[PDB]
Amino acid sequence: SVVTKSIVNADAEARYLSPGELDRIKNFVSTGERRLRIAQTLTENRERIVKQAGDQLFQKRPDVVSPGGNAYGEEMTATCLRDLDYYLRLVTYGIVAGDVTPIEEIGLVGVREMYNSLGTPIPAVAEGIRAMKNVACSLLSAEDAAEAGSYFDFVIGAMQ
Amino acid sequence: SVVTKSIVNADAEARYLSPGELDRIKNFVSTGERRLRIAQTLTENRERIVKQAGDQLFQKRPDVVSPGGNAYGEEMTATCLRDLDYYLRLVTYGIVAGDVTPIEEIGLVGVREMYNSLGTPIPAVAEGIRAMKNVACSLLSAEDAAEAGSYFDFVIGAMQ
Amino acid sequence: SVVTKSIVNADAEARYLSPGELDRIKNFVSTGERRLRIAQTLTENRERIVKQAGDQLFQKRPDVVSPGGNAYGEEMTATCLRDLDYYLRLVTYGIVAGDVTPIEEIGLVGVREMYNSLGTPIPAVAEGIRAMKNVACSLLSAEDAAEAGSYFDFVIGAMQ
Amino acid sequence: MQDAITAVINASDVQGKYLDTAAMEKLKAYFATGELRVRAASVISANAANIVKEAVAKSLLYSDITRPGGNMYTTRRYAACIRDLDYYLRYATYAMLAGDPSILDERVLNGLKETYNSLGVPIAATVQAIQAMKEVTASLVGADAGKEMGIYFDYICSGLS
Amino acid sequence: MQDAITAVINASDVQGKYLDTAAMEKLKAYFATGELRVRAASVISANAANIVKEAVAKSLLYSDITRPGGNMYTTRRYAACIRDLDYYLRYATYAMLAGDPSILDERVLNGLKETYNSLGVPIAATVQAIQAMKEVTASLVGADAGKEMGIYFDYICSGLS
Amino acid sequence: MQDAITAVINASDVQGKYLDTAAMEKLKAYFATGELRVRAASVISANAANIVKEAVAKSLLYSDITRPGGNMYTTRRYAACIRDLDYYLRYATYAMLAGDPSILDERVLNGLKETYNSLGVPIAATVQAIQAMKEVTASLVGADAGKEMGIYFDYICSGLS
């Protein structure tokens, strides 16, 4: 969070938090209620987002669910929708945290090493979370869709 | 001491003490009897030096013993004369050691951090040991006053 | 050995042995039988090589076995022939190892520090192993004398 | 390190669950008390030198530790002691501002007791100094902010003992 | 480190004896099996990624360790685990190619159990992964080369336990 | 480190007292014996290589330790041993010249026994070498200077055991 980042930077230089850094915590705590509502909206509409994002993902990339692909079969396709559920769960942490550190530490650090070993196409995984972004943001308002979308974009960029 | 310094420098380069460094111990042990007499003279006239140095110190800096100052009152003034006694005791160690290391390690390393926390004016403390120098050297001979005075000057310079 | 060197270099860069490095083990294991025959020939003719090399060594350097020298007397001369036996035993390890690491680690690393403390002339020791080289190579064939001689030369060069 | 927000996230992360209805209330508790934490941090930052000064004079000064033979004796060990109180006050403010004592376990208390017992620093005397700052800080920041700081002051004292 | 050749040399070195008639036969045993060791190393080097992949899918994947709460969970700890199998496979190949497990004691097993028990890595799960690679490697390299590799695979598992 | 002078100063420093009438006599004892210490140091410095040579030949050479299997065997371990005797002789001279064994505790004996027991160096053999140098040094420096050196030679041997 911004509170954690402000303390780490302040502790590094051996000093108390500056008036500017304290102000970054002041607005963070005031706008905390806003981000919790955004997190709840995605949490309530969790099953719908994963299903629709999957349907759009397999439409754009049929080779993954076709014979020879990584997500071929009911079990392999169901496991792919769980990956989407994981990153959707990480996005909700990223939103409520106010930064992309929870998303980074958990499901992004060494993400290509995982999928290359599994044999999963990571650009296909990146295209999957693109589908979640559009389905998730459509539920949220115009202002909230812009805020929540920046966390999805970070997950897309890390995979690319 | 010079013996300690000669061993530390010799051990650093991995070698026995050089003919020159051994000669620095030869004259040190011969002139040791001289410095002990200087140390005893200050030790015998210990109470007089502290009293007169205090009287001169408060004459030059009345603000410290005036209302609002650091040494205001009987207890606060008595504590200041103890500080003078400490540095006088350190000077006697410095003399008998043949160098300013005992003075440095004990009462000088992080001396400004102490007095700034206590709220004591350190230039006033430096002016205090100036008084001790003049009172202490007056008891000693012309040759001994020059030798003993160099240790007082080191304590003055460290505070400044 | 070449196998040890190939693994150490491969482990340093974090990788499996290259096709070239594996080939250095392929020829090493094939030519292993050749070097064992060379090692046995020196081992069988062990007592003769040391005796003749000693006789030639003391002929070229009589001062060592003369009064005042390091190898003066029966016990001191016998101890010198043991040194020759040690380096001959190390040469046989060097041959069978395929490199001069066993010779280096055992009897060469800090060899001048030993002989300078003992007071032995190391160029005389180098001249001793020159005698062993010529006596040892004469027993071996033309091809084997060239191979085995390179290990003796390494022991000569390390002493110089 | 962790704070009140990320600590709740990691709790739900290990279980593999989304943010629960109970977990959301823990975050709302931190956000509602956010301005109260920041207000206290600015007061302690301004009166950083004074809190350490009064705490030392109240508990440490004029006693065996300051006298020859004691551990505070000499300017080096005196300056080294007030430096620790400057750390304890600063690291206590981080723990309060973060709302989680994870920073105290990692970057302060980790191998602190062993370092003192080796060098010969008195733990009982150190605790009285930190407890002195707790009372001094509470008077400045107030009753609400003073209690929250006191939790992390007592946490440092618990780690030493 | 040591190999089959230098290990025999050091054995004769400590005794202060030349290469015995029995000691020569130990070297000839290594030289005769030299091409068989090199052939196996090239096969494992080519199928380095596949051996680790199949071993993880057989033993590790689809279980509590991969799920939230487990030790393989998260991409960092997942990537860190397959990295260990890449080491164990590579260091096992060195031990086989050298013909002496001295490299495993020095540059792998030295303080490995203590590092896991500190961080909280399951040893029982790690052994199953290495034992999985032993069966996968044996099918590729053959029966002769598979047994020799298995000695140094089991040596790593013995060091962990 | 400390010497005879600064050791007396630190003793009076912890008590918080000036140099006592008894404390002055301890310093005068060091100054009166100052030229005797310096004379001995110059003799050992000149005969530094010879003292170590004779000590090794008397105690260490022609025995199991020098033979294959022993700890002095090989040129690396032989050269490493005489290097230690060069240290012990040099650090013993510092202790004598300083008149205080504080240098031996800090920059020599600190974790020395643990380093040997790990590597496998014989302590009993090391003591005989140092005790050999004590007898060799005593013949050169004399009876007066030989006794004073012997105190710090035996101090090193006491630290190892």
Ligand SMILES: *[C@H](C)[C@H]1/C(=C/c2[nH]c(/C=C3N=C(/C=C4\NC(=O)C(CC)=C4C)C(C)=C\3CCC(=O)O)c(CCC(=O)O)c2C)NC(=O)[C@@H]1C
């Ligand atoms: C006198 C020249 C100045 C002065 C001094 C003053 N000092 C104090 C209090 C203390 N001074 C010390 C000093 C030392 N401690 C050490 O270990 C050493 C090195 C050996 C020194 C020099 C200490 C420890 C104290 C704290 C009391 C204690 O001993 O426990 C005061 C009192 C401050 C107060 O208000 O409490 C004063 C006034 N005062 C002056 O005006 C001069 C400039």
Ligand SMILES: *[C@H](C)[C@H]1/C(=C/c2[nH]c(/C=C3N=C(/C=C4\NC(=O)C(CC)=C4C)C(C)=C\3CCC(=O)O)c(CCC(=O)O)c2C)NC(=O)[C@@H]1C
């Ligand atoms: C003051 C209340 C007490 C006290 C303290 C004292 N400390 C030391 C020496 C050290 N103290 C520390 C403490 C910290 N290091 C850190 O990184 C942090 C925050 C993470 C703290 C709180 C360290 C590292 C040292 C060693 C450094 C050094 O230069 O010595 C001393 C000196 C001990 C000595 O002999 O060296 C003292 C006196 N003293 C008291 O009397 C109080 C109880």
Ligand SMILES: *[C@H](C)[C@H]1/C(=C/c2[nH]c(/C=C3N=C(/C=C4\NC(=O)C(CC)=C4C)C(C)=C\3CCC(=O)O)c(CCC(=O)O)c2C)NC(=O)[C@@H]1C
């Ligand atoms: C879907 C967009 C893509 C896809 C995915 C797919 N994944 C798997 C198997 C696993 N995926 C994971 C993922 C994670 N583990 C984590 O800890 C995190 C961070 C929180 C993530 C994102 C794991 C652990 C597995 C292993 C199974 C297990 O949970 O134990 C598969 C199956 C591969 C196989 O053949 O076995 C697939 C297919 N597939 C696609 O086609 C999309 C590109």
Ligand SMILES: *[C@H](C)[C@H]1/C(=C/c2[nH]c(/C=C3N=C(/C=C4\NC(=O)C(CC)=C4C)C(C)=C\3CCC(=O)O)c(CCC(=O)O)c2C)NC(=O)[C@@H]1C
């Ligand atoms: C995989 C089969 C198991 C597993 C492993 C796992 N390991 C770690 C962390 C580390 N692992 C090592 C291992 C090695 N270091 C080496 O140098 C070598 C060869 C000589 C090996 C095999 C090291 C050094 C670390 C620490 C480095 C780091 O960045 O953490 C973790 C993460 C633990 C953590 O919380 O940090 C994991 C998960 N995990 C499993 O579940 C398998 C049983």
Ligand SMILES: *[C@H](C)[C@H]1/C(=C/c2[nH]c(/C=C3N=C(/C=C4\NC(=O)C(CC)=C4C)C(C)=C\3CCC(=O)O)c(CCC(=O)O)c2C)NC(=O)[C@@H]1C
């Ligand atoms: C012969 C060519 C030269 C010579 C040699 C000589 N050596 C000694 C005594 C020793 N030599 C050794 C040598 C080694 N020790 C090792 O560990 C290795 C590596 C494997 C070697 C080469 C040792 C240990 C000794 C000490 C005796 C012992 O074994 O305990 C002497 C005797 C010196 C004396 O006066 O005591 C001599 C004369 N002498 C020559 O003249 C040639 C130049």
Ligand SMILES: *[C@H](C)[C@H]1/C(=C/c2[nH]c(/C=C3N=C(/C=C4\NC(=O)C(CC)=C4C)C(C)=C\3CCC(=O)O)c(CCC(=O)O)c2C)NC(=O)[C@@H]1C
């Ligand atoms: C000689 C009397 C004995 C002996 C010694 C021996 N020592 C080693 C290895 C080391 N010895 C030291 C000793 C010191 N380090 C210091 O800094 C000081 C002064 C402060 C001393 C005295 C150290 C650091 C080492 C390790 C360095 C290294 O390169 O190994 C060995 C070799 C052990 C090994 O296998 O590595 C030996 C043989 N040997 C004897 O037999 C005598 C009893």
